[PDB]
Paper text:
In order to gain insight into the function and the post-translational maturation process of the glycosylated 66.3 kDa protein, three crystal structures were determined that represent different maturation states. These structures demonstrate that the 28 kDa and 40 kDa fragment which have been derived by a proteolytic cleavage remain associated.
The average temperature factors of only 24.1 Å2 and 19.5 Å2 for the amino acids of chains A and B, respectively, indicate an overall well defined conformation of the 66.3 kDa protein structure. The crystal structure contains seven N-acetylglucosamine moieties (NAG) in total, which are part of five N-glycans at the asparagine residues 93, 115, 236, 441 and 520 and are well defined in the electron density map. Additionally, two intramolecular disulfide bridges are formed between C147 and C157 of the N- as well as between C497 and C500 of the C-terminal fragment. Non-interpreted electron density was found at the sulfhydryl group of C249, which is the N-terminal cysteine of the 40 kDa fragment. C249 was modeled as cysteine sulfonic acid (OCS). The oxidized side chain of this N-terminal cysteine is involved in the octahedral coordination of a cation, which is additionally bound by the side chains of S246, E328, T330 and Y379 as well as by the main chain carbonyl group of D315. Since sodium acetate was present in the crystallization buffer and due to the absence of a peak in the anomalous electron density maps calculated with diffraction data sets collected at a wavelength of 0.8 Å, 1.7 Å and 1.9 Å as well as the results of fluorescence scans (carried out at BESSY BL14.1, data not shown), it seems likely that a Na+ cation is bound to the protein. This is further supported by the octahedral coordination and metal-ligand atom distances of 2.7 – 3.1 Å.
Residue numbers in the entry:
A (entry chain A): 63 to 238, 245 to 248
B (entry chain B): 249 to 592
The structure:
Amino acid sequence: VSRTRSLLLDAASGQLRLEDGFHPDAVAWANLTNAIRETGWAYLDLSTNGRYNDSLQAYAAGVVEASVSEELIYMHWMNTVVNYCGPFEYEVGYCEKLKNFLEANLEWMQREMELNPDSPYWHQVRLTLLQLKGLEDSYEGRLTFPTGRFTIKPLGFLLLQISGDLEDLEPALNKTGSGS
Amino acid sequence: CSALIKLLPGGHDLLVAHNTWNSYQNMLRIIKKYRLQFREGPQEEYPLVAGNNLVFSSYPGTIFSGDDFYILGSGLVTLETTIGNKNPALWKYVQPQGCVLEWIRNVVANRLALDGATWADVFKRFNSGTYNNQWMIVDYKAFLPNGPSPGSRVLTILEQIPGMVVVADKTAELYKTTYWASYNIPYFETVFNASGLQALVAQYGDWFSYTKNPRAKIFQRDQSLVEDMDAMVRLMRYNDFLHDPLSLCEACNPKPNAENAISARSDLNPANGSYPFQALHQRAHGGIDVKVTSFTLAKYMSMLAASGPTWDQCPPFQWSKSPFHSMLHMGQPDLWMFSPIRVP
Ligand SMILES: *[C@@H]1O[C@H](CO)[C@@H](O[C@@H]2O[C@H](CO)[C@@H](O)[C@H](O)[C@H]2NC(C)=O)[C@H](O)[C@H]1NC(C)=O
Ligand SMILES: *[C@@H]1O[C@H](CO)[C@@H](O[C@@H]2O[C@H](CO)[C@@H](O)[C@H](O)[C@H]2NC(C)=O)[C@H](O)[C@H]1NC(C)=O
Ligand SMILES: *[C@@H]1O[C@H](CO)[C@@H](O)[C@H](O)[C@H]1NC(C)=O
Ligand SMILES: *[C@@H]1O[C@H](CO)[C@@H](O)[C@H](O)[C@H]1NC(C)=O
Ligand SMILES: *[C@@H]1O[C@H](CO)[C@@H](O)[C@H](O)[C@H]1NC(C)=O
Ligand code: NA
Ligand SMILES: [Xe]
């Protein structure tokens, strides 16, 4: 019903490592209480540590979130997007267009960040995408904190974030959720 | 999605509520509380962002709300209902370069904003023309219990379609009418017209009208009965489609339609019914939650929240006793009969 995990930075090795329980020295920690059977909700509480820079905090936030919610992520993926643009998809035209659109959009953001290292706006965008990268990396069980550019998979955990955006991307890309 | 911002009699409180409509297969839910220490800019000298603390309704693996409903430590509550776009001539404004996807713009605006005006300023940059919503930004820092209208700052409304974002402070209007309701139709006439809704009103009638659609009429009839949090929950869960004249669809057979409610139950419409357009069909889709907060609750980063389709006057949804028993719903309860809880 409940699980707590912290992400530590081993200064010795410079390696990030997950530990069970609460370690307020860690870069981040989270705990999840699953009360779905009783209330229809689970509850996640997550904190990051201001002693580390915000890029590392953001990546760590994704990591610890995935770490305490892996089961729920798997089930939600299966319930909602497991078939979306899969290996047997009939609409190969649309799926290729979508993938191309997302890859180009992600690349464009990475370029803007590189071109604007002093921008507050692009700093906030980078924090958001670092959190997404940490969520996926942690779910896949292999951590790698990027100090420069990084590649978000167009059809990985990005798909859990773009359900609303897809309501419009579909017709915009001529394909043949939330709202009315 | 349906939303209601309600000034209680005498200005005693200001309640904000949102009811997500979504597919039933999406009902694995997580309420998330983040306490971050991010800074406004890439150097340690920058101030901490305004939105480092936030509580929001969400889903597994989803690092924003999606509903959307957020209570921010900056004193803002942000929420939206989706308006979409029906004008294909605007799709040319959806481009991979020069557009940031809406979920990112939402997260960044929530982090940086100190007030409604700044939220709008941040959010509207690099408008993607995707997840086109009417956003409501309530700034509780501008709300004085029992006070008269401050004229500005309390409520900001933003509407996005591809190529166009319109923003206005609607504090005076909120104080004049005592509420602001939202129900998937744009308020701004320029947005309503640009997004192709006039053709839909011409073809199908008042269901697509901003002022005359069923939810608009139900809020007009009933919003004044919201005199407290519990009354808010009751309205936001409201669906009595078999008996409410406002739920009748004259073009449908049968005429009562379970989509025509504050909290839709499309699973209850018959599969062999005759319907003029897809939204009115039997569907495994409808209102799936309600979240409500108030001036005091928001101050304590708290809300009342209820999970699952409405069962106040409709029979509770149950997967195994529905037309949809074969759909994947791993991890979900079979029967959905939950009551609101205080969170945290
Ligand atoms: C934020 O702090 C992290 C952790 O100290 C920094 O990451 C190190 O960056 C250097 C390269 O500059 C690498 O040699 C180390 O391997 C990195 N550590 C880890 C754990 O990957 C990082 O440079 C700081 N700044 C930013 C923007 O991330
Ligand atoms: C939005 O579109 C509507 C519908 O075309 C416009 O309303 C029409 O306006 C003209 C000129 O005033 C009238 O002669 C028509 O009778 C109106 N038709 C209606 C009310 O359905 C409206 O002016 C447009 N609004 C904006 C702000 O562009
Ligand atoms: C996380 O642990 C803290 C420790 O005090 C507890 O108070 C809180 O209820 C827990 N939250 C969750 C999501 O289980
Ligand atoms: C979609 O189809 C229209 C033709 O009506 C075309 O003009 C447009 O370029 C197409 N969009 C994409 C992204 O394929
Ligand atoms: C429609 O289906 C319902 C549900 O089984 C059935 O009772 C009713 O007879 C049907 N009406 C028509 C027109 O078939
Ligand atoms: Na929505
Ligand atoms: Xe985008």
